[PDB]
Amino acid sequence: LKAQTKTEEFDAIKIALASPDMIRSWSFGEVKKPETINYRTFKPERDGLFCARIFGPVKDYECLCGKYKRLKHRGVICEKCGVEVTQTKVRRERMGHIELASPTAHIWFLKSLPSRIGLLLDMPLRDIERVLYFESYVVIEGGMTNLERQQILTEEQYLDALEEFGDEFDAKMGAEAIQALLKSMDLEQECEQLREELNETNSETKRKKLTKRIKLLEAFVQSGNKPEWMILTVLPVLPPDLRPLVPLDGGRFATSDLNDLYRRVINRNNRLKRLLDLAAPDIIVRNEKRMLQEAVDALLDNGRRGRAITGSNKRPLKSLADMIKGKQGRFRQNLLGKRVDYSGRSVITVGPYLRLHQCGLPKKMALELFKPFIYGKLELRGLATTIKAAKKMVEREEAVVWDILDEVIREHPVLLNRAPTLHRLGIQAFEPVLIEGKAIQLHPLVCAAYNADFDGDQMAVHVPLTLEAQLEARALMMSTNNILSPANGEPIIVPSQDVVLGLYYMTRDCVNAKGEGMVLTGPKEAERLYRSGLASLHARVKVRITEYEKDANGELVAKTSLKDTTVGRAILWMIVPKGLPYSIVNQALGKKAISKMLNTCYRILGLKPTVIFADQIMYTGFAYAARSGASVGIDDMVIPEKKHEIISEAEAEVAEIQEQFQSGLVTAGERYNKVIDIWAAANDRVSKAMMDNLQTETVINRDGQEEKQVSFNSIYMMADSGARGSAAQIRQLAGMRGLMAKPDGSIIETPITANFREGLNVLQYFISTHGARKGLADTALKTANSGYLTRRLVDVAQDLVVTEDDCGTHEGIMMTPVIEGGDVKEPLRDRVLGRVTAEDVLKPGTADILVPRNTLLHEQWCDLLEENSVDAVKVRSVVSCDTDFGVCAHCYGRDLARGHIINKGEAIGVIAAQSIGEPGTQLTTGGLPRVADLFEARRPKEPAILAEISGIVSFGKETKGKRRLVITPVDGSDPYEEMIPKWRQLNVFEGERVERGDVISDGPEAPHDILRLRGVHAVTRYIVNEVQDVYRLQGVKINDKHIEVIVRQMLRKATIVNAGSSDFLEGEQVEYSRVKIANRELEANGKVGATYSRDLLGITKASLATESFISAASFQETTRVLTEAAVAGKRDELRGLKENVIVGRLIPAGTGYAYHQDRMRRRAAG
Amino acid sequence: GRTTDPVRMYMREMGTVELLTREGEIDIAKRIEDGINQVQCSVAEYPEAITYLLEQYDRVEAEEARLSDLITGFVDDPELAREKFAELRAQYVVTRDTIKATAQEEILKLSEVFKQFRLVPKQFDYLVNSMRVMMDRVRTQERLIMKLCVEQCKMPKKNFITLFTGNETSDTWFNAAIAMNKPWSEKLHDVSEEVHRALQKLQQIEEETGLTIEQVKDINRRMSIGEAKARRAKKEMVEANLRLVISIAKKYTNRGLQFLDLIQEGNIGLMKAVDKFEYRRGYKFSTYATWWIRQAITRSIADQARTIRIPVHMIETINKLNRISRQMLQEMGREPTPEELAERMLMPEDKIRKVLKIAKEPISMETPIGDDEDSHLGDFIEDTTLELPLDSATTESLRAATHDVLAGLTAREAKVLRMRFGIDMNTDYTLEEVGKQFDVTRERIRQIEAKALRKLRHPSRSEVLRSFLD
Ligand SMILES: [Mg+2]
Ligand SMILES: [Zn+2]
Ligand SMILES: [Zn+2]
């Protein structure tokens, strides 16, 4: 078969240096003139930056001169002025060139930090630049006389040496010099010689640089790049429409800055050719060559020399490098964003009538958005003759079009998105419901996922177009299909505020109320008792209920009974579906309980019942909260009667200690601590006064004189239910508020005695103001820090995707309850839930396997483990996965919005990064910066040091700035000796044995140490436990999984120790390496297999290494990446997410995982 | 040492050169005269340089050229030219027949008359080029004959130059020197077919050019030396005078061209000034060079300093328009009306507006607009040349509609209507063409077409198409 020549669907991409002949291959003509357009007739001046002949026709299928105007003549080259008449679009495509007079350095390869021309020649940068500027002479191929090959000479020196040796010696200067150097260079010979020199001399200094350079050279040879190409003989010109002259209003013109630059280049070039033909003196033509160099540099990348300025405008002109780089840090237009058709946005409102699967979409918006569908559906049914008439109709908004819109809307989902998109739930698919209004209506239960208030936040709509997009939106991005946070299995659909105040008010009980003590047949006549005004919503009552238990085999058992409950609970029970026990609704129904109701319902009945359940819960919560008549008055906030007395006594203490400071019994600072302590104690007392009084003070009589229960006061119910408010804010309302602190952080010893229910005076308010402003500032800052962090995270993860099914390794980490210092800061059940078992586990007695090797532990399995006393389970993790270049689903876990095991092909790196990132706004060394420090693996300020090796140790030498520690292993050799500065107080016992990784001092320790001296499981455990300490201290739920995948990405690279295939000390992929030593253990060499050492790379560091260069050019410094890749002739195969996002094809994950896989196997095959 | 910023590595590099004394200028200029006159005389000593000029004047009076393309004039009109050329031809026709010892005295005078002619620079260049190219022709045979002996047949060059000098044509060296019984002598036989045959163009040189291989070297060698002296001296002068160029170019700074560009153009101007200067007129070289440098600078600025190139007169016009503004601005109290300076200017006066427009430089497309954000002017320029999809769909539908409707008419009427217009076909066809195709011709078609239109005119047919016209 003939493979192909012309257009196919391409794979990979290649980048390298460009030959002059190559640059010519692209060029369809040489632009010889600085002229742009004719100045009256605006036609392009022929062979100029804007040209019809070289580039293309000005208007569609029309010759410039005007002779051939017909769409027939096409491949015709006009005789008058040759222009092939073709679409004007080809003026957006065709390149050009300029043949420079003198050679020119390409500023990218001269000024890139590791100067390419420089280190290829082993020639220092400043020397090379000194040569290019004609500031000195440099030797080339010196032969055998007096002189080194790379040696530089001055005027007089060159003269003398020339007088001595006429021939068999050579020296040039300028660009031609460097080009001659590069051309003369033989890489292979240098290779041989350097291998030898590497071998002969033993010094670290010598062979380090030696090996680095030889590797560099041989890489450059293998590239296919010849050094000469770093010096430009020919300069390509960019297509005109990519740097347009296009006219504006007022007859004014506007053009790209590349025109000024290209113009300058052409000018000085032609003038140089002229100066050559005029036989000018050296001092002139040299100046001209230099100026040409500067012009070219300014064109390519401006700012590495002089930063030339555009005509009449101070602001420096944008060069091609600046064209590529973009702005806003690193953003390549697939990054910062891209404008998109079929979209819209507006202010959002509530819409409680909605089912959770839908959203209100404004009429006009739907019309405009679905306009093309409407056009097609209108003439398909034949209501409109032609598409034109269809437009006329929808523009007239004729009566018949609304029905057609209702047709095209029905099964067609739409995507809704909010401004701060963090986790994947930031975008959710809904079924559109036509609404009269300009506002978008969004289901209340979703408001938590978007973090969307109703205070004027806006949402954007996007219309999924292709069939695949509709089905993706419906089966993936659909609201009902994500009920659970991907971070943790807990429901994100949890009722928010009004609803929970409703369910809370519903099931609650007062002491005495209408219908107290009576009995009812069932929930029906309970509700009937309530709605008729006979019985009160909350009263202690026995009613018969019928509950169910699915506890049979897949089967629902029925049981009936007389339960002691209230009227409200009885009414509410009507909603609860099937197999749930009445136990769940018989409580007070707080936010937590009202959430666990949903959770249990989902882990029992399945998805659909849970969906409709949540819906009904919302409806009833709203309705009954509305009926309840909850409100807030000024008298709802109750101040303690004892407040003033507490204030007075605590105010007596301060005058006590003040008297002592006057008499000098106590020091000023000690005094300060004392007074601050008494005032703090005061605040605690007032708070714990107002809390008792607010909470229990309802004193009410049933048939006797008195009884007291939890208060029915509004603000209390609100704070208690979890609807809104909290003990702190309520404390600020009634009790006194806090003690403030100056910006310094020195806490003021005269606290705010007054509260918000009372007035604050001038000073108090002024002092509160700082707290406010710093609050807004800090929060608004932590948003940015969160974003930056997530960014680093997806950058370090991204392409990690579930790929294989099961690697099948027994490997994994030991999962224990966290058990910190007190009782159980987090159980075992949460840590092991949804995680696969590495191996079978035991009862206290054995040959009884409860959980059999690798099995997803769901709620039932975890409860079965809980029945038994088992404290310990070994669990497979993403960090331990044997699979290379990805994670097997069997290792990951089940976690998702769905309880089933993770699908094959879902991209986990991204969702992990997101899951870690989203809560980051809620985090307060400790803190979010501590989190960053952890993920960056930064060695702390005052780190500890761990024993290098086990065995008895002792102290040696003296006081040089380090008092040396000598370790003595039992069997093995002693010589390990570390230099410990003695000015730091030690721990380690001079007479005792210390295990490797023991405490030889105090303070935090760098995870590099934990990785080396303790090992991979130990280091991953340290990272996960510390970061989880940070999050969990703030009340943030994040599964260990995501952190573990980030960790896996951190340790991706490692350094080799032994040899037999590749180089000694190289940092490299443990995927590559392990797949190589697994392959080397058999066949090949019988075993030559090398030993490596696992390395720890920070997230920002590990992100640096990416196979794909297109990917790297996105988030890294673009200018460097492009060069560094171009010299190696690096070939990007795509294969990742970011790269395929940039190039604009299907993501090698998700739905596209079926595509890229089917193509991946076709590649490197028959 | 080097701050870069090439203005500096220039400023310092030229600043080494010392300023010329008033006498040094005349020394150098005298050197110039020496060199040039050497090449001129070397031109006068070439026979072909004469004969060519003669043939060219034979072509001039034959109307195959013009008197301006040969001479710039002599020292000193067509009659005078005719008689001067007559004089030249006379000295040539004497010197030619006198070749029979005494002839030299005339061959000298033959040069003199030939020197009376001031040649067009182009012609002179053609002559010089002819000479040096002829010397390429000599060097070809010299090196051929040398390599065929030394490199191929193994003969030492030391013995190779012995019978060479003074002859290098006749058979004295080739045929009489191979019998010498030297180690290299008998080896000369293998190549003898190649050396003797390429010796044809050699001796031929002494026929066309009219000089033995001896003289052909000496003359244009002397020429080469002269040119060398010339260029050497002139270069020296310019290198000495660069400071003037700089000092002048400092005036033209902000006109829209870079500093070094200015001083380079001015440098070129100084070079031209050296080339055209004559010290015999007593005019100081400084004030003479000034005009030239200023000329190159201004001319170049006018030409290349804009994105949109404008003619010189237009530029000057704009400038005058500026002057009028400057005077009348505070004079009129606000500014003169757009038509005010119009009458002040000589031309039609509405031109102001037109001119006033085209004068404006295009705004950088990268000009930032509000928020300081990535919003830049060029981001908001919308493509108006794109056709909207809303219309594209209708362009696609119109084809289906007119296709169905064209399925309506008789197969021949359909063909005639599809032919009279470009429907599904290349171009479109003249009605005569349609006639010659259909074999039923002329008025006939025009009738059928009409009735065809008539069939699609009244609605059953018309309801589908009428919906298209908006
Ligand atoms: Mg808000
Ligand atoms: Zn044409
Ligand atoms: Zn695995």
Side-chain angles (χ1 to χ4, degrees), chain A residues 34-40 42 45 245 251-253 255 263, chain B residues 302-311 315 357-362:
Chain A
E35 279 98 316
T36 50
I37 53 184
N38 169 272
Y39 117 104
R40 176 43 249 165
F42 292 143
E45 214 85 53
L245 236 178
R252 275 209 308 194
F253 277 52
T255 189
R263 203 152 39 86
Chain B
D303 227 357
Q304 69 185 195
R306 311 250 305 205
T307 31
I308 37 173
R309 182 164 78 87
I310 46 183
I315 306 163
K357 180 151 299 181
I358 309 292
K360 292 179 299 183
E361 257 285 310

Short mmCIF file of all heavy atoms in Angstrom, two decimals, chain A residues 34-40 42 45 245 251-253 255 263, chain B residues 302-311 315 357-362:
data_model
loop_
_atom_site.label_atom_id
_atom_site.label_comp_id
_atom_site.label_asym_id
_atom_site.label_seq_id
_atom_site.Cartn_x
_atom_site.Cartn_y
_atom_site.Cartn_z
N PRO A 34 10.54 47.48 2.29
CA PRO A 34 9.88 47.95 3.51
C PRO A 34 8.47 48.48 3.25
O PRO A 34 7.70 48.65 4.20
CB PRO A 34 10.78 49.10 3.97
CG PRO A 34 11.42 49.59 2.72
CD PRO A 34 11.68 48.35 1.93
N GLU A 35 8.14 48.75 1.99
CA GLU A 35 6.83 49.28 1.63
C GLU A 35 5.71 48.32 2.01
O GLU A 35 5.88 47.10 1.95
CB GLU A 35 6.75 49.59 0.13
CG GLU A 35 7.36 50.92 -0.29
CD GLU A 35 8.77 50.76 -0.84
OE1 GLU A 35 9.56 50.02 -0.23
OE2 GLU A 35 9.07 51.38 -1.88
N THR A 36 4.57 48.87 2.40
CA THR A 36 3.41 48.06 2.75
C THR A 36 2.33 48.16 1.68
O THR A 36 2.11 47.23 0.91
CB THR A 36 2.83 48.48 4.10
OG1 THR A 36 2.64 49.90 4.13
CG2 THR A 36 3.77 48.07 5.23
N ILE A 37 1.66 49.31 1.65
CA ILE A 37 0.60 49.57 0.69
C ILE A 37 0.81 50.89 -0.05
O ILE A 37 1.49 51.79 0.43
CB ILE A 37 -0.78 49.54 1.35
CG1 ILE A 37 -0.81 50.48 2.56
CG2 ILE A 37 -1.11 48.12 1.80
CD1 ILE A 37 -2.11 50.44 3.33
N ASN A 38 0.19 51.00 -1.23
CA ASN A 38 0.48 52.06 -2.19
C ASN A 38 0.19 53.51 -1.76
O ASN A 38 0.71 54.44 -2.38
CB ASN A 38 -0.19 51.73 -3.54
CG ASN A 38 -0.17 52.89 -4.52
OD1 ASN A 38 -1.07 53.73 -4.52
ND2 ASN A 38 0.86 52.95 -5.35
N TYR A 39 -0.59 53.68 -0.68
CA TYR A 39 -0.94 54.98 -0.06
C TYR A 39 -2.14 55.75 -0.64
O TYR A 39 -2.64 56.67 0.00
CB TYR A 39 0.29 55.92 0.06
CG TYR A 39 0.21 57.22 -0.74
CD1 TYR A 39 -0.06 58.43 -0.11
CD2 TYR A 39 0.43 57.24 -2.12
CE1 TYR A 39 -0.12 59.61 -0.83
CE2 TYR A 39 0.36 58.42 -2.84
CZ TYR A 39 0.09 59.60 -2.20
OH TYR A 39 0.03 60.77 -2.91
N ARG A 40 -2.61 55.38 -1.82
CA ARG A 40 -3.87 55.93 -2.32
C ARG A 40 -4.81 54.79 -2.65
O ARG A 40 -5.76 54.52 -1.92
CB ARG A 40 -3.65 56.85 -3.52
CG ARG A 40 -4.93 57.39 -4.15
CD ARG A 40 -5.95 57.86 -3.11
NE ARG A 40 -7.12 56.98 -3.07
CZ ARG A 40 -8.02 56.97 -2.09
NH1 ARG A 40 -7.89 57.78 -1.05
NH2 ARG A 40 -9.04 56.13 -2.15
N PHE A 42 -5.14 51.28 -2.08
CA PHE A 42 -4.54 50.67 -0.90
C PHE A 42 -3.90 49.32 -1.21
O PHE A 42 -3.43 48.62 -0.31
CB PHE A 42 -5.53 50.62 0.26
CG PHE A 42 -5.88 51.97 0.79
CD1 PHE A 42 -7.17 52.25 1.23
CD2 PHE A 42 -4.93 52.98 0.84
CE1 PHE A 42 -7.49 53.50 1.71
CE2 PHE A 42 -5.25 54.24 1.32
CZ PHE A 42 -6.53 54.49 1.76
N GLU A 45 2.03 47.05 -2.39
CA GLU A 45 3.20 47.26 -3.23
C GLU A 45 3.88 45.91 -3.42
O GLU A 45 4.16 45.23 -2.44
CB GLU A 45 4.15 48.23 -2.55
CG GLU A 45 4.91 49.13 -3.50
CD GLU A 45 4.11 50.36 -3.88
OE1 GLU A 45 3.65 51.07 -2.96
OE2 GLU A 45 3.95 50.62 -5.09
N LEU A 245 -2.75 45.06 8.49
CA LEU A 245 -2.79 46.51 8.33
C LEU A 245 -4.22 47.07 8.36
O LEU A 245 -4.42 48.26 8.11
CB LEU A 245 -2.12 46.91 7.02
CG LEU A 245 -0.96 47.90 7.10
CD1 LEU A 245 -0.41 48.13 5.71
CD2 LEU A 245 -1.39 49.22 7.73
N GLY A 251 -11.21 56.52 8.81
CA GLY A 251 -10.24 56.26 7.76
C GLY A 251 -8.85 55.93 8.29
O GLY A 251 -7.92 55.76 7.51
N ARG A 252 -8.72 55.85 9.61
CA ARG A 252 -7.43 55.54 10.22
C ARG A 252 -7.07 54.07 10.06
O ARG A 252 -7.93 53.21 9.90
CB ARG A 252 -7.42 55.92 11.70
CG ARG A 252 -7.07 57.37 11.97
CD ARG A 252 -6.39 57.53 13.31
NE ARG A 252 -7.15 56.91 14.39
CZ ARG A 252 -6.94 57.13 15.68
NH1 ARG A 252 -5.98 57.97 16.07
NH2 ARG A 252 -7.68 56.53 16.60
N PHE A 253 -5.77 53.79 10.14
CA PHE A 253 -5.27 52.43 9.97
C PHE A 253 -4.67 51.93 11.28
O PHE A 253 -4.23 52.71 12.12
CB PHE A 253 -4.21 52.39 8.87
CG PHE A 253 -4.78 52.29 7.49
CD1 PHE A 253 -5.75 53.19 7.06
CD2 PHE A 253 -4.33 51.32 6.61
CE1 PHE A 253 -6.27 53.10 5.79
CE2 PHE A 253 -4.85 51.24 5.33
CZ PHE A 253 -5.82 52.13 4.92
N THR A 255 -2.09 48.61 12.74
CA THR A 255 -1.24 47.50 12.33
C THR A 255 -0.40 46.92 13.47
O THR A 255 -0.11 47.60 14.45
CB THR A 255 -0.29 47.90 11.19
OG1 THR A 255 0.37 46.73 10.69
CG2 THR A 255 0.74 48.90 11.69
N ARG A 263 10.17 45.75 8.98
CA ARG A 263 10.55 46.89 8.15
C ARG A 263 11.98 47.31 8.44
O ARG A 263 12.79 47.42 7.53
CB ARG A 263 9.60 48.07 8.39
CG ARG A 263 9.53 49.07 7.26
CD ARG A 263 8.17 49.76 7.25
NE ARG A 263 7.70 50.04 8.60
CZ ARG A 263 8.02 51.13 9.29
NH1 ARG A 263 8.81 52.04 8.75
NH2 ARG A 263 7.55 51.30 10.52
N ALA B 302 12.56 60.79 4.40
CA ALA B 302 11.33 60.96 3.64
C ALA B 302 10.90 59.64 3.04
O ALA B 302 9.73 59.29 3.03
CB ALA B 302 11.52 61.99 2.55
N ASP B 303 11.87 58.92 2.51
CA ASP B 303 11.52 57.71 1.82
C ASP B 303 11.05 56.57 2.74
O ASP B 303 9.93 56.08 2.60
CB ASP B 303 12.69 57.26 0.95
CG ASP B 303 12.25 56.89 -0.44
OD1 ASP B 303 11.03 56.94 -0.70
OD2 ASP B 303 13.11 56.55 -1.28
N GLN B 304 11.90 56.16 3.68
CA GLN B 304 11.66 54.92 4.43
C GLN B 304 11.06 55.02 5.84
O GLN B 304 10.84 54.00 6.48
CB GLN B 304 12.94 54.08 4.47
CG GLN B 304 14.06 54.68 5.31
CD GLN B 304 15.35 53.88 5.23
OE1 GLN B 304 16.25 54.06 6.05
NE2 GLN B 304 15.44 52.99 4.24
N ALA B 305 10.79 56.23 6.33
CA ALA B 305 10.44 56.37 7.75
C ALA B 305 8.98 56.12 8.11
O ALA B 305 8.59 56.23 9.28
CB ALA B 305 10.88 57.73 8.28
N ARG B 306 8.16 55.76 7.12
CA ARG B 306 6.75 55.51 7.37
C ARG B 306 6.35 54.07 7.07
O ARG B 306 7.01 53.38 6.30
CB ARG B 306 5.89 56.45 6.53
CG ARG B 306 6.31 57.90 6.60
CD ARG B 306 5.29 58.73 7.35
NE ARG B 306 3.95 58.59 6.77
CZ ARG B 306 2.99 59.50 6.89
NH1 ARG B 306 3.22 60.62 7.56
NH2 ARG B 306 1.81 59.29 6.33
N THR B 307 5.27 53.62 7.69
CA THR B 307 4.67 52.33 7.38
C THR B 307 3.99 52.43 6.02
O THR B 307 4.06 51.51 5.21
CB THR B 307 3.64 51.94 8.44
OG1 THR B 307 3.04 53.13 8.97
CG2 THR B 307 4.30 51.17 9.57
N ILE B 308 3.32 53.56 5.80
CA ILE B 308 2.75 53.89 4.50
C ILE B 308 3.64 54.90 3.78
O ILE B 308 3.71 56.07 4.17
CB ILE B 308 1.34 54.48 4.64
CG1 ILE B 308 1.25 55.37 5.87
CG2 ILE B 308 0.31 53.36 4.73
CD1 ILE B 308 -0.06 56.12 5.99
N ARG B 309 4.32 54.46 2.72
CA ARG B 309 5.23 55.35 2.00
C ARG B 309 4.48 56.46 1.28
O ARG B 309 3.46 56.22 0.64
CB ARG B 309 6.10 54.58 1.00
CG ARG B 309 7.09 55.48 0.27
CD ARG B 309 8.19 54.69 -0.42
NE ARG B 309 7.75 54.09 -1.68
CZ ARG B 309 7.78 54.71 -2.85
NH1 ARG B 309 8.24 55.95 -2.94
NH2 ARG B 309 7.37 54.08 -3.94
N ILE B 310 4.99 57.68 1.41
CA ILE B 310 4.40 58.83 0.74
C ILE B 310 5.43 59.55 -0.12
O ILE B 310 6.60 59.65 0.26
CB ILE B 310 3.81 59.80 1.77
CG1 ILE B 310 4.81 60.03 2.90
CG2 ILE B 310 2.50 59.27 2.32
CD1 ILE B 310 4.30 60.93 4.00
N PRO B 311 5.00 60.06 -1.28
CA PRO B 311 5.87 60.84 -2.17
C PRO B 311 6.41 62.11 -1.50
O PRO B 311 5.80 62.61 -0.56
CB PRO B 311 4.93 61.21 -3.33
CG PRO B 311 3.90 60.13 -3.34
CD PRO B 311 3.68 59.80 -1.89
N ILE B 315 4.86 65.09 1.35
CA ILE B 315 5.47 65.35 2.65
C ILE B 315 5.66 66.84 2.85
O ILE B 315 5.20 67.41 3.85
CB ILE B 315 6.83 64.64 2.76
CG1 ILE B 315 6.68 63.15 2.44
CG2 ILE B 315 7.42 64.84 4.15
CD1 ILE B 315 7.98 62.45 2.13
N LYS B 357 -5.80 63.58 6.12
CA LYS B 357 -6.10 62.20 6.49
C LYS B 357 -4.88 61.31 6.28
O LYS B 357 -4.36 60.70 7.22
CB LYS B 357 -7.31 61.66 5.72
CG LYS B 357 -7.65 60.21 6.07
CD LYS B 357 -9.14 59.92 5.90
CE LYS B 357 -9.97 60.80 6.82
NZ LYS B 357 -11.42 60.52 6.69
N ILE B 358 -4.42 61.23 5.03
CA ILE B 358 -3.38 60.28 4.64
C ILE B 358 -2.05 60.48 5.40
O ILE B 358 -1.24 59.56 5.52
CB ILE B 358 -3.16 60.31 3.10
CG1 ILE B 358 -4.50 60.15 2.38
CG2 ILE B 358 -2.23 59.20 2.66
CD1 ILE B 358 -5.11 58.77 2.55
N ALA B 359 -1.86 61.69 5.93
CA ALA B 359 -0.65 62.02 6.68
C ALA B 359 -0.52 61.21 7.97
O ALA B 359 0.59 60.92 8.42
CB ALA B 359 -0.64 63.51 7.00
N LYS B 360 -1.66 60.86 8.57
CA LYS B 360 -1.67 60.20 9.88
C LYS B 360 -1.05 58.81 9.86
O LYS B 360 -1.36 57.99 8.99
CB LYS B 360 -3.09 60.14 10.44
CG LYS B 360 -3.68 61.50 10.82
CD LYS B 360 -5.10 61.38 11.35
CE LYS B 360 -6.04 60.79 10.30
NZ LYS B 360 -7.46 60.72 10.76
N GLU B 361 -0.17 58.56 10.82
CA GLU B 361 0.47 57.26 10.98
C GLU B 361 -0.49 56.27 11.61
O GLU B 361 -1.25 56.63 12.51
CB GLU B 361 1.72 57.39 11.85
CG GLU B 361 3.03 57.37 11.07
CD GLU B 361 3.39 55.98 10.60
OE1 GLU B 361 3.38 55.04 11.43
OE2 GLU B 361 3.68 55.81 9.40
N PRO B 362 -0.47 55.01 11.15
CA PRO B 362 -1.37 54.00 11.70
C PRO B 362 -1.07 53.70 13.16
O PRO B 362 0.09 53.59 13.56
CB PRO B 362 -1.10 52.77 10.83
CG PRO B 362 0.25 52.97 10.29
CD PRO B 362 0.39 54.46 10.08
#
